[PDB]
């Protein structure tokens, strides 16, 4: 995020870091329950990647993070790689998350819920702060 | 480029797909929602993470960070997967697995 700010630690408890086997953060995701993470299809997650829950500071390993293996990747069959449309994948965890103060689920909308243009929302992540 | 160690946040507005198309044209599909162009931007490495809005007091997943400006321009809207267009598939997948 460019021109954002540091979050309060633990205050976005559904936010996960998707890391490859070398430990490199390559994408975010959101816990929707103890067993499932929602991410983008174009992130290309495989069962060799790791879901890291409970993280705040990726350079300080004093925190009680949960490194969760991925059992299966469910890329939405409607994903279109050419247009990046329907850009959603579900990750079924091999090991369930243990919900806590710093690890818990985001709500899903109903398909009929409305979010008007002009509404102020929030986005979070460990993406670049400057390109 | 700078990657942060610490989790970042930003507040930003939703756009309408019609207005987002002034920036992105026919690249915008019904299963996308735009947000930003407001002095902040999602950027590389944010993909897959949340765009949340409060609904009846609970943070609700409205978007999944997807794509946008290759330089993360803060005057151009970001594009997110529109979760209301995708939530039936989520529920079906969870039920079947």
């Amino acid at each position: 995020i460019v021109n954002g700010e540091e979050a309060v630690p633990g205050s976005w408890p559904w936010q996960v870091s998707l890391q490859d086997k070398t430990g490199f953060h390559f994408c975010g995701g959101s816990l929707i329950n103890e067993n499932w993470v929602v991410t983008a299809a174009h992130c290309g997650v495989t069962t060799s990647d790791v879901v890291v829950a409970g993280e705040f500071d990726q350079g300080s390993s004093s925190e009680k993070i949960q490194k969760l293996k991925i059992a299966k990747v469910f890329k939405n069959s409607k994903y279109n790689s050419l247009t990046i449309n329907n850009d959603i994948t579900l990750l079924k965890l091999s090991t369930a998350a243990s919900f806590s103060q710093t690890v818990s689920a985001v709500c899903l909308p109903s398909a009929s819920d409305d979010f008007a243009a002009g509404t102020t929302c929030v986005t979070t992540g460990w993406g670049l702060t400057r390109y | 480029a700078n990657t942060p160690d610490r989790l970042q946040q930003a507040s930003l507005p939703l756009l309408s797909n019609t207005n987002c198309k002034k920036y992105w044209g026919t690249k915008i599909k019904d299963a996308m929602i735009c947000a930003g162009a407001s002095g902040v931007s999602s950027c590389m490495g944010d993909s897959g993470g949340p765009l949340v809005c409060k609904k009846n007091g609970a943070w609700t997943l409205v978007g999944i960070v997807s794509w946008g400006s290759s330089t993360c321009s803060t005057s151009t809207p970001g594009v997110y997967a529109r979760v209301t267009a995708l939530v039936n598939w989520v529920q079906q997948t969870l039920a079947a697995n």
Partner: peptide
């Protein structure tokens, strides 16, 4: 869902 135990500060 959606109600963090540690409240975000925006």
């Amino acid at each position: 869902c959606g109600v963090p135990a540690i409240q975000p500060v925006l």
